[PDB]
């Protein structure tokens, strides 16, 4: 007879290994790759973890957990030593399996109290509970200040909550001073946030910054008018041929776009100029301005229904325009925390050990990311690339030997994308703890939880003191090992007997 | 869109200042695309006398189109209908820039005067026009009198 095991295949915060080592995960902050709990929420999980449900209800503490998941073991141990009665060589394995677990579940358990007991008398730990607005616990402060696969980043949103609680940023934002501050909320005058704002900041209620406003041949014009001069004329000297040098200038353009495209013939074949245009199609005159003359040009020169017939980025989703503050402050932020994705791949690869928000606070380059941001969101540009070009521009500046190839650039959109969205309700935006799995680091992904081995915690709360025995090795341990996203449920238990039984229920599916 | 708003008020200048003696075209409103216009029938033709509106409605890239030109007036005509549609070649295929918005009344006005039934928009009238001149005449006279006058 297969017993009824009560070991449970999963528990909160209890990794188990290939080799049947148990894992305890200290969490950091809800999540997977990006944290979802910032400012003064940030805490909740620690809270959780070293006291359960003292505040508010519905979740246990570790302690708790693992004292079951001990006794759990304890049950099925007796049960498998009442069957070997019966059957000598019974479970075999897994009955030292089990003792193995139960030998190391007591150990962390020690260790947790050991940590309240003898070692919070700065009370980090107990803070946790009395506190309004915890810190984190030093220990945990300092696995993140070491992490080479985690950081924090911090923006700054229009209202900043003060009440950020992660240290050191690896990119960060010169913010405005919040409302929880001593003087209260006031807007900074400089910085990225502050020229963002001012320049996707519609100037009033009744008229907004809209998404095209650019026909692909609005844009040809405009290409076109950049090249003359300041002073430059319809009306002066040599007429014909300053159509010449424009029509010029408009078959430049042609050809960026299209091949078919010609200037000699209006769609009749006959010679086009400016007697031609002042005459015969009587398009253009005296009064007509130089911008006037590149229409007409155009106009002449193809049909008007094939401008017409000539994937959806963060920037635009359902929004067609900028109308309210609101709708400003949000595409401010996406701009920064793209920013700070690209600065999270660069650091992560190992490219730049910068801080790239440092940068684009400065003079010339706050001012201009946010109007060349501007710019595209009312043709309709990819915005993307254009803060991608910026900093291909400037790399050297921002502590990278070299460009980002379009594959980087993919990949960074990518993330960006995933992780905005999984954000993007966030109460606050002021901070984010993100964290790659695919690394090098001491920083985990399991059950929905940004987190560091308990014991690593406990290694750096204590300072070394207090001995970890027969834990020794576990932290190392769990570090060799394919990855950093640990899977839920933990398969050395569970053994794939719900597997045979995901099985038995599709056998019924058949009849 | 200015391209042919600046064209259109040079036709309208034109028509202004030397109109012709048997047309007349201009806008409603300040409108400048939608016109209306009036052929008189020929002194040599059964239309002789009546008096024929049109509506001209211009499109955005004017000149490089036609315009779209039809009798608001009922006219008993080979190359005309109860819709308004006249047939012309040069509203169709033979359009071109040089082409002014009064060569087409003009052209509206000869073939009133000198009809062709071989490009027949209504059929029945041109069995009539090619077998019976005095019964097309008598009919499209009294048609001239009744919806035209």
Request: charged letters at 30%.
């Amino acid at each position: 007879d297969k017993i009824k095991f009560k070991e449970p295949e999963r528990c909160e915060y209890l990794h188990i290994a290939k080799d049947n080592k148990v894992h305890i995960l200290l969490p950091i902050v809800g999540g997977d790759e990006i944290g979802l709990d910032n400012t003064a929420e940030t805490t909740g999980e620690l809270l959780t973890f070293f006291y359960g449900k003292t505040h508010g209800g519905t979740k246990y503490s570790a302690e708790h957990h693992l004292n079951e998941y001990k006794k759990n073991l304890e049950d099925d141990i007796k049960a498998i030593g009442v069957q070997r009665k019966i059957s000598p060589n019974a479970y075999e394995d897994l009955l030292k399996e089990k003792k193995e677990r139960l030998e190391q579940i007591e150990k962390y358990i020690d260790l947790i109290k050991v940590l309240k007991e003898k070692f919070d008398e700065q009370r980090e730990i107990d803070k946790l509970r009395t506190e309004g607005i915890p810190q984190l616990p030093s220990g945990v402060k300092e696995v993140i200040k070491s992490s080479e696969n985690a950081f924090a980043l911090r923006l700054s949103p229009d209202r900043p909550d003060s009440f950020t609680r992660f240290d050191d940023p690896l990119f960060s934002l010169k913010r405005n001073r919040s409302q929880y501050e001593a003087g209260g909320y006031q807007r900074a005058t400089d910085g990225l946030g502050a020229r963002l704002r001012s320049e996707l900041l519609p100037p009033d209620k009744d008229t907004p910054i809209v998404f095209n406003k650019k026909s692909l041949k609005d844009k040809i014009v405009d290409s076109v008018l950049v090249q003359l001069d300041k002073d430059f004329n319809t009306k002066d000297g040599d007429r014909g041929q300053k159509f010449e040098d424009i029509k010029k200038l408009v078959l430049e353009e042609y050809k960026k776009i299209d091949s078919e495209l010609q200037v000699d013939e209006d769609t009749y074949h006959q010679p086009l100029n400016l007697d031609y245009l002042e005459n015969i199609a009587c398009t253009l005159d005296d009064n007509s301005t130089a911008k006037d003359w590149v229409y007409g040009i155009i106009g002449a020169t193809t049909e008007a229904d094939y401008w017409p017939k000539k994937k959806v980025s963060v920037f635009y989703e359902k929004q067609k325009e900028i109308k309210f503050e609101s709708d400003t402050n949000t595409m401010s932020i996406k701009v920064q925390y793209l920013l700070a994705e690209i600065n999270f791949y660069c650091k992560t690869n190992k490219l730049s050990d910068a801080n790239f928000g440092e940068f684009f606070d400065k003079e010339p380059h706050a001012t201009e990311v946010a109007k060349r941001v501007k710019e595209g969101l009312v043709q309709g540009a990819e915005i993307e690339p254009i803060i991608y070009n910026y900093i291909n521009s400037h790399h050297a500046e921002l502590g990278l030997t070299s460009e980002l190839s379009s594959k980087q650039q993919e990949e960074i959109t990518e993330k960006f994308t995933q992780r905005y969205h999984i954000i993007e309700n966030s109460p606050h935006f002021d901070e984010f703890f993100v964290a790659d799995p695919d690394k090098k680091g001491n920083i985990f992904s399991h059950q929905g939880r940004m987190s560091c081995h308990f014991l690593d915690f406990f290694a750096r709360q204590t300072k070394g003191k207090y001995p970890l025995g027969d834990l020794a090795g576990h932290q190392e341990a769990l570090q060799a090992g394919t990855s950093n996203r640990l899977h839920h449920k933990n398969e050395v238990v569970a053994q794939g007997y719900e597997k045979f039984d995901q099985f038995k229920k599709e056998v019924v599916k058949l009849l | 869109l200015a391209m042919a708003l600046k064209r259109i008020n040079k036709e309208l200048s034109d028509l202004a200042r030397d109109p012709p003696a048997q047309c007349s075209a201009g806008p409603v409103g300040d409108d400048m695309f939608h016109w209306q216009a009036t052929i008189m029938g020929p002194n040599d033709s059964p239309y002789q006398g009546g008096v024929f509106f049109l509506t001209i409605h211009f499109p955005t890239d004017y000149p490089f189109k036609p315009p779209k030109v039809a009798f608001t007036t009922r006219i008993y005509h080979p190359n005309i209908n109860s819709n308004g549609s006249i047939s012309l070649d040069i509203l169709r295929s033979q359009w071109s820039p040089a082409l002014t918005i009064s060569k087409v009344l003009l052209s509206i006005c000869s073939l009133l005067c000198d009809p062709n039934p071989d490009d027949p928009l209504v059929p029945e009238i041109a069995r009539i026009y090619k077998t019976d001149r005095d019964k097309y005449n008598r009919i499209s006279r009294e048609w001239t009198q009744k919806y035209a006058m």
